[PDB]
Prior knowledge:
Blueprint: E1 5-7, H1 16-22, E2 27-32, H2 40-54, E3 59-62, E4 64-66, E5 69-70, H3 91-108, E6 113-114, H4 137-153, E7 159-163, H5 186-198, E8 203-206, H6 223-233, E9 239-244, H7 256-266, E10 270-272, H8 277-286, H9 306-309, H10 313-329
Parallel strand pairs: 1-2, 1-10, 2-3, 3-6, 7-8, 8-9, 9-10
Antiparallel strand pairs: 4-5
Amino acid sequence: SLGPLWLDVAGYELSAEDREILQHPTVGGVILFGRNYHDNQQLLALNKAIRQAAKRPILIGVDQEGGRVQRFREGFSRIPPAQYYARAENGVELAEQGGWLMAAELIAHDVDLSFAPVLDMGFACKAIGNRAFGEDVQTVLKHSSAFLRGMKAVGMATTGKHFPGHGAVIADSHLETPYDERETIAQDMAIFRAQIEAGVLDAMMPAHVVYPHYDAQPASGSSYWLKQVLREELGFKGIVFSDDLSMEGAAVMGGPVERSHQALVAGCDMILICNKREAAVEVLDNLPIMEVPQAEALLKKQQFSYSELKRLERWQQASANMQRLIEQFS
């Protein structure tokens, strides 16, 4: 946890190469993907090996939102798209069950966190779509707050995304980066403001999106968005993640070291390099050695097995209810 860099590994088992890189002090976390997941026991063994190799505490994360974004499916409870909760008569009750269930099952497999929830507003952006909890401020706040309560209940740190709002993003040929040209994104940012003020977000992941009325840089590499707005105007005190620095579609920001430097200078606490071991190594070989002690707040607060979890009536009911919810609106 102590170093700023999150990286990833090639497959189902840790390689000798992986074990060495995990000991580099600049490393703070491992992000897992579908390619790292075969089955429950293999996942437990992988995470055990990551923790053994690291020696010191290290973060293990995954994108596990439900619906279209659920990396670990086989042998896990299926979690619905975030959109479904508000379509039910007891959406707030069910959203809390979804957040609790998703989180509990990750903790049972030795994962610290999921990069969730989505706080984006509306379904019109193809990349977001039914990953959003609703189409208006109240609906998003109501159901995302519930989902957050569920995650917190089992001791999982929360991550709001994609700040300052990905709900209305366009990614055609007008600009070289996905963009939102609205003169005001007040409604979208109001959601983030409300959740920051309620004190329920441990971390934030910014959008790799340009908001040209506001600033030239994608929010994820923007000193305006990540310092002036997120810290000074909104008062956020948690961890700021970068976007995946292995990609920058405009291709104007230089190599991985330059991109990493800009994310840190812009206001990111931790940086992510996915799918590109050679880029991660270049960053490791060149970045100053730094520590992110405040990131220890992201380590999970509970430990239990999947067997133990299943003895809870809470699990029995949540898992059954999530299946019924999926069947209801699919």
